[PDB]
Amino acid sequence: GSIGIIETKYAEFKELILNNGSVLSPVVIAYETYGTLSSSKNNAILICHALSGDAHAAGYHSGSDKKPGWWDDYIGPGKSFDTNQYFIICSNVIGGCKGSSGPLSIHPETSTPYGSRFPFVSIQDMVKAQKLLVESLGIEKLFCVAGGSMGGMQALEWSIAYPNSLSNCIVMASTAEHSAMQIAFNEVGRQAILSDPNWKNGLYDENSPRKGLALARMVGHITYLSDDKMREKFGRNPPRGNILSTDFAVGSYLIYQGESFVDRFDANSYIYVTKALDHYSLGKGKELTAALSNATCRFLVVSYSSDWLYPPAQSREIVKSLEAADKRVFYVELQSGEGHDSFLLKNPKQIEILKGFLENPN
Amino acid sequence: GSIGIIETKYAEFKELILNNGSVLSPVVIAYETYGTLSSSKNNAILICHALSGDAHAAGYHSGSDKKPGWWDDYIGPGKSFDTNQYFIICSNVIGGCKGSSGPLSIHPETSTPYGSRFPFVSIQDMVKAQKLLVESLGIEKLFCVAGGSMGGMQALEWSIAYPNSLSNCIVMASTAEHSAMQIAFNEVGRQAILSDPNWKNGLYDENSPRKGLALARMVGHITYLSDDKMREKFGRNPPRGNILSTDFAVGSYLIYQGESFVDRFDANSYIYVTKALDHYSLGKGKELTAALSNATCRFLVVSYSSDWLYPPAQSREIVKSLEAADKRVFYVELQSGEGHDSFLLKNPKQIEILKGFLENPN
């Protein structure tokens, strides 16, 4: 079942010209691979990560690791992304903070992290960079591109940016454009970092805006409860006593939400990645239909009943435009009990729809 | 059109026993009145405020005022809440920070603001306190209770807490219970205050958590844009350059969102009031039907097409349960271009539905 110990690898390329005119020189892409690439180069699947995720989508880095990769129940021998049949790839987005070109990259003049000097990146840029990686691994046409949430937005971009470079596209718990609500949560997170005393115009190094970023990320932990589970927590009555008595007053630490200072993220990177998500729009209705008419691949769109961050209605708009464009598309709404990240959890019915989609080309 | 210069008045009562067991002694209720109460005591309308609002719902405090009351386009001679016909009342919620019993109330021992020593209050408590005020003004049965958002939740509570003490109930852009999404925005705001260095377990006095509260309140400004107007702002591409170049780096001040330090709010009060909102639940479906079966008054429920904070679906659940309970209920979804506070803005079609509801008892 487990793919075992995996090394993070680093592909470096001379440059990447970004959509906003700026240039990454060089471009580094941290990635991991699972399984074995066929001599025909045609069994490869690209996994695109979500906001919290990275290149480490499966297995372990060392024996002492306490948790496997972020989609480990779905990637491995016998699992939904079967490393017995397929060559599975996952890479850290540029703008990210776990190995690819991003704000933590060392500046060629100051020998300090780029920080706020790093250029703004878009989802189209992130996908251009993934294309470079995939070509470098010897692949001209991927079998599949898959991802959920932020990862599904990259997967959608692939289907139209390089429409003939993939046969299949799996878009889980995702959207063609962020709602005002999604943008608002990210904007609050970004402002928390910006107003943190340690922010220093983004040129922090000794002392990062840990508090601001803790707040920015807590958003993802608070939003994890479904409507029902949040109401269960809150009930029909407020607490007894006062803010001091309930120890509600001593709640500063709850900003980290059980998570430690060692599982490390970066404030600049959060700003860079969420800005890419918020500024990406394929539109809706007629405009989305027109945008998606480039695609040639087969589509699997999966939404989750309790997901209110990327709700079934956002998936439905994609499926509606993919039918208006005369494209091969299947749509499954899975029953779920979580606020957004249900695509991550082992679920018999998810496993089944994935294995069957990849197994049956109709 | 304008009601003119208004004094804030203060009604004080010996005690109020709260639902959580704690006691307010004394209870102070800051209120304002507009128009003239009939000798029959039967033309009175209670206005319930929203999260940002207060008792000052109409007119001016002095000639030098730069803005009138928060619902001034709706309260006055000839306006929708006609002070030529009606006696209009609005009061600051207990737990609030603009005159009623709340965390800024001076403690009888320390002669400093209660702060975090103030007891948790509920919407049922807020309405109990309003009942006291209304009785004190000589009123046994109100003609109407009206409000939007948070104010509509108080108005709903009235219709079932004192079902025979009102003839009509206007519930605008509101809900019988907060969604996980609504609670999440408030929770982020509360955590911003809790993690602010000046929070001091809520016993701040010299130096308040201004930054934390700025963040908490910015949420209400960011969420103000509709899906379309937010997408218009964000477009299909991220900015040119980097965080430093776009002056995106110097964005600390944007936490106040144009608003000054003089228009003053309180961090404890924000915690108290949003906790009351988040912990209030009449439920949904059968449970909401059962809860609302106590009501005897006539209902007007108004939602707004672009409101995604308190979306039409929350209003529909109320109207559905009010029909399942065999109650007099009208439902209008008004077209709007804002993210939540459309009930505040002058709108010919809102004016018309309000004046006609109050004028025609059928």
The third-level CATH topology of the largest domain in chain A is Rossmann fold
Following the backbone from N to C, one meets helices and strands of chain A in this order, namely: EEEEEEEEHEHEHHHHHEHEH
Q: Please tell me how large the radius of gyration of chain A is.
A: 21 Å
For the largest beta-sheet of chain A, the strand count, sense and barrel status come to:
8 strands, mixed
Proportion of strand residues of chain A: 15-25%
Could you characterize what this model shows?
Two copies of one chain form a homodimer. Chain A is built from nine helices and twelve strands. Chain A is globular and about 65 Å long. In chain A, a hairpin with a 5-residue loop joins strand 2 (16-17) and strand 3 (23-24). With 362 residues, chain A is α/β, with parallel strands linked by helices. Chain A has two domains: 1-178 and 280-362, Alpha/Beta hydrolase fold, catalytic domain (Rossmann fold); 179-279, Rna Polymerase Sigma Factor, Chain: A (Orthogonal Bundle), CATH 1.10.1740.110. The longest helix of chain A is centred in the middle third of the chain and has 15 residues, at 180-194. At the A-B interface, helix 3, helix 4, helix 5 and helix 6 of A face helix 3, helix 4, helix 5 and helix 6 of B. Chains A, B: It comes from Leptospira interrogans serogroup Icterohaemorrhagiae serovar Lai (strain 56601). Chains A, B: It is found in: Cytoplasm. Chains A, B: Its EC number is 2.3.1.31.
